[PDB]
């Protein structure tokens, strides 16, 4: 039913190596070229990625910022209220960002904020202009 294990013998392949005299040499030569073709294409991306790899020298160690470890409070200082409205304007509905800007309000103190101070801060207007950009 099936070849010895390892011997590769497609019916399709067979015809292709017999179809003329030198067809067997001819198909093998292409593959020797298809092989060089890919092989220097490797060293050429291997070359191009070694360049892109050096531009990342040093990573972003200088550009990192230490951690604000701050305990997540309940009351809304007018300061924090105003940071909120400006964050809503520049952050749309992405509360994690608004939570990270205000710094001491959990992502759920933010939603509540969205309804409690909704009418006093015209969030509908503020949000619809976030939609403008």
């Amino acid at each position: 039913r099936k070849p010895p294990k390892g011997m590769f013998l497609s019916q399709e392949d067979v015809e292709a190596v017999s179809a003329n005299a030198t067809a067997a040499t001819t198909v093998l030569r292409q593959l020797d070229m298809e092989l060089v073709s890919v092989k220097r294409q490797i060293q050429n991306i291997k070359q191009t990625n070694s360049a892109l790899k050096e531009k990342l020298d040093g990573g972003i160690e200088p550009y990192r910022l230490p951690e604000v470890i701050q305990k997540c409070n309940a009351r809304w200082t007018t300061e924090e209220q105003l940071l909120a409205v400006q964050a809503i304007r520049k952050y749309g509905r992405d509360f994690q960002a608004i939570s990270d800007v205000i710094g001491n309000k959990s992502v759920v103190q933010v939603k509540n904020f969205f309804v409690n101070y909704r009418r006093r801060f015209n969030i509908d207007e503020v949000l619809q202009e976030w939609e403008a950009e």
């Binding site: 010895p4 011997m7 497609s10 019916q11 892109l52 531009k55």
Partner: protein, 666 residues
């Protein structure tokens, strides 16, 4: 196998079924009730066992019935019918036995046999055994034909056949018990030795052999499962199919490297896109940081928009710093994957020149077995005789194989030095026309009822003919002679004054430099008591070495040995012999093979006898007169001695049946 059933197996017969042979002679029994068939089958096996258990004395019908028991010996005519059938076909009382009943004083019928080869002798023996007048015509000045044995002083070495392929069910097993033959086993171990003169290391030696055996199976799969048996009108040969397999394995080695390296580009290039996000993100991070710095440099106290800016920019930089960290995470995985693929590469080559040269030696052996370039063996049929292999170790004959023909020739009318030139066969008899090989003008005419022709296939093949048939052989016969293959394999005999090889090794190889010279002195045998090394010349090389002096050939042999054993321990040979079987005009070759475009069916054609036309038109169809035997006529066991013998036994059977009557079929 053992018992009465061991006798059936040792007689090449199914112990529990009637053969087609036997249906022909016992059509009452085989078409009859199952009980009768078993009784018959026992009587058959039992008589075979008797003959086998002691083959130096004739087995008379009386002796058989004696030793049978009821209910088996209740029916005498069944036992008589059966014993005669075995006797006629050489299954019992063949070879060399003391006759109980001496030969009838007057013989009935007269037969000429062309060739005292082993097939010839064996039929001669059986026909005389049957009370017929039998004269053999031999062109040579010695009997045995292709079983030749060099003898000078204490040196002994067959130039012809030298091995007995196993005694499991082999007639030579009877002949050996039959006449002393020093039969010694052949230890299977064969070290190879490259052109340099050093052993192939064991690791390579098994991994080439296994690839060889694996390639062979591959062709058999091409033949039977893909039906790759005809190409561009011509039938495909074994050699062709081996190349198509080696090519498709070298193909696969390349498709395998391509699709591996093509996993590297497909990852190298995921990395290219990953580094481009990362270098464009380190740039956005470079910029926001500057911005966040500028924003926190507006010292406080500040208004809330200016305060929001510092916080918002800080968030952003933290956002883009999360991204760039997740991407040098991903950069680590892909960097690791590239080391994996660039460190488990698939195989560089299919076979290197050292490996391929060694493999070429395994092909030289196969050209040796079949006595022909693998390019000429039929792909579909080259191994059709492989089912009928005997069982047991292969053996050699240490006193020379000539001992067997000579033994057989005892008591026979053999005209040596007698070249048959014309076989002439008519509705009323035949006349064979021979000359004397020494002065060829001196001419001989032999008249006979029937001519048994054991001319080598190579002789039968000569153009222009060495032997004229009058009338011509019919086309169905002469076409079978062209289609069939008759190959060649010669050997060199090297007689030294001291053993300088491994005496525990019977045979050791030599690897050739080229594919083109893979057969040239590719194998050596330590087989004999005396210091004799025997060297094979097979394949395409056989036919070319016949054009090269003995000194040149022997010189090449010494050099190969020097390489393997060192110039000091290999002295010049005391006696040397080189065979030239294609040259020899009484053989014109070594033995047959299943050529491309032939089949085993041609071997059966070679054995059909010829029945000549009626002398007077309107006379009834005549008796057959020209019969054929020999190694090329036994389809199931070709190109051997046991096969030659078997065919001689065979024709002797059907000839006696013809002119002596078959009283066993009633």
């Amino acid at each position: 196998p053992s018992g009465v059933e061991g006798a059936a197996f040792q007689s090449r017969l199914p112990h529990d079924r009637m053969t087609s042979q036997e249906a022909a002679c016992f059509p009452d029994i085989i078409s009859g009730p199952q009980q009768t068939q078993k009784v018959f089958l026992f009587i058959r096996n039992r008589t075979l066992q008797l003959w086998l258990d002691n083959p130096k004395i004739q087995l008379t019908f009386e002796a058989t019935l004696q030793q049978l028991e009821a209910p088996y010996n209740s029916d005498t005519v069944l036992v008589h019918r059966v014993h005669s059938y075995l006797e006629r076909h050489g299954l019992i009382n063949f070879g060399i036995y003391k006759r109980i009943k001496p030969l009838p004083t007057k013989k009935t019928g007269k037969v000429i046999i062309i060739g005292s080869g082993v097939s010839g002798l064996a039929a001669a023996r059986q026909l005389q055994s049957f009370g017929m007048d039998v004269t053999l015509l031999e062109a040579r000045d010695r009997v045995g034909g292709r079983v030749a044995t060099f003898r000078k002083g204490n040196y002994v070495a067959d130039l012809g056949a030298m091995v007995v392929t196993g005694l499991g069910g082999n007639p030579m097993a009877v002949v050996s018990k039959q006449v002393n033959m020093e039969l010694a086993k052949i230890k299977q171990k064969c070290p190879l030795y490259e052109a340099n003169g050093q052993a192939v290391p064991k690791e390579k030696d098994e991994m080439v052999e296994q690839e060889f055996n694996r390639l062979l199976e591959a062709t058999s799969y091409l033949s039977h499962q893909l039906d790759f048996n005809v190409l561009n009108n011509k039938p495909v040969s074994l050699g062709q199919a081996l190349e198509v397999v080696i090519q498709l394995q070298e193909k696969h080695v390349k498709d395998e490297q391509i699709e591996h390296w093509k996993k590297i580009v497909k990852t190298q290039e995921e990395l290219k896109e990953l580094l481009n996000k990362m270098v464009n993100l380190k740039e956005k991070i470079k910029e926001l940081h500057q911005q966040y710095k500028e924003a926190s440099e507006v010292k406080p106290p500040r208004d809330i928009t200016a305060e929001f800016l510092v916080k918002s920019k800080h968030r952003d930089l933290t956002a883009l710093c999360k991204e760039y960290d997740e991407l040098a995470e991903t950069q680590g995985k892909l960097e690791e994957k590239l080391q994996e693929l660039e460190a488990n590469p698939p195989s560089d080559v299919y076979l290197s020149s050292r490996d391929r040269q060694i493999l070429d030696w395994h092909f030289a052996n196969l050209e040796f077995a079949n006595a022909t370039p693998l390019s000429t063996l039929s792909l579909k049929h080259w191994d059709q005789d492989d089912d009928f292999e005997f069982t047991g170790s292969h053996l050699t004959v240490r006193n020379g194989y000539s001992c067997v023909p000579v033994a057989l020739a005892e008591g026979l009318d053999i005209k040596l030095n007698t070249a048959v030139r014309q076989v002439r066969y008519t509705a009323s008899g035949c006349e064979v026309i021979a000359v004397n090989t020494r002065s060829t003008s001196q001419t001989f005419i032999y008249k006979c009822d029937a001519v048994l022709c054991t001319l080598p296939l190579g002789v039968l093949k000569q153009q222009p003919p060495a032997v004229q048939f009058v009338p011509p052989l019919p086309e169905w016969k002469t076409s079978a002679v062209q289609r069939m293959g008759f190959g060649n394999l010669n050997k060199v005999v090297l007689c030294f004054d001291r053993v300088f090889w491994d005496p525990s090794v019977n045979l050791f190889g030599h690897v050739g430099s080229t594919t083109a010279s893979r057969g040239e002195l590719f194998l050596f045998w330590n087989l004999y008591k005396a210091p004799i090394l025997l060297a094979l010349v097979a394949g395409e090389a056989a036919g070319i070495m016949e054009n090269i002096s003995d000194d040149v050939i022997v010189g090449r042999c010494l050099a190969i040995l020097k390489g393997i054993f060192g110039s000091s321990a290999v002295p010049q040979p005391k006696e040397t012999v080189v065979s030239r079987w294609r040259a020899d005009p009484w053989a014109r070759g070594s033995y047959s093979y299943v050529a491309a475009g032939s089949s085993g069916n041609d071997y059966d054609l070679m054995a059909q006898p010829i029945t000549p036309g009626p002398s007077i038109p309107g006379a009834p169809q005549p008796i057959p007169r020209l019969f054929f035997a020999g190694e090329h006529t036994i389809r199931n066991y070709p190109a051997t001695v046991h096969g030659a013998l078997l065919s001689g036994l065979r024709e002797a059977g059907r000839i006696a049946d013809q002119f002596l009557g078959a009283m066993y079929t009633l």
